[PDB]
Each structure stands twice: as structure tokens, then as C-alpha cells.
Amino acid sequence: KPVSLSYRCPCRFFESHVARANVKHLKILNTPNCACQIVARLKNNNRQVCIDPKLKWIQEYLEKCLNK
């Protein structure tokens, strides 16, 4: 299995502008060689996709999460 000894980021490609209508929840996993990295686990149609954590809805989401 791929172990994090070498620099391996889960996003081989990342879904930028992914549909929030398709997301169930976000799993945030900052891998050593990569920026803040989020993988979103999707609804029944898809599985998981690796997210662009630079998306405005992600940024806003993070920001509101501080206290709500």
C-alpha cells in the first residue's frame, strides 16, 4: 500500500468547482508535500473526490465553521 514516507498526495487531480449538491461531507487531510487538502465524500452517484480548498464555497464554509 502507498505509505506516507515518500511524498504522495491523494489529489492526483483535484476537483475544483465540485458540486456541493453532490457532497455529503469533507475530510481534511493536509499531506506533507501539499497545501491544505480536502477530500469530499460524495452522495450516491459518486464516491470521493479531492477538492480545491481554494474554492469560495470552501473558504466561506471554513470561515463560518469557526463559530456556528
Binding site: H17, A19, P32, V49, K56
Partner: protein, 38 residues
């Protein structure tokens, strides 16, 4: 980017390497209302 240490070695098990959705973006802290580009 600041922090004492991040999650100290998750050893992330790749569950789908994904395949890109649409465009890309970058925040600037200062809000961006009109962002029409795809």
C-alpha cells in the same frame, strides 16, 4: 501556513486519485463577488 505541527503523519490511504472537475481558484481573503470565469 502557520502551525506548531500539522497532523503528525496521517499516512494517507489514497481513496480515489480523482480526475479534476472544473477550473481552479485562489482566495485572497478579501472577498470576490464577481468571479465569472470557468
Amino acid at each position: 501556513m502557520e502551525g506548531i505541527s500539522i497532523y503528525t503523519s496521517d499516512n494517507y490511504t489514497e481513496e480515489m486519485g480523482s480526475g479534476d472537475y472544473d477550473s481552479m481558484k485562489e482566495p485572497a481573503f478579501r472577498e470576490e463577488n464577481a468571479n465569472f470565469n470557468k
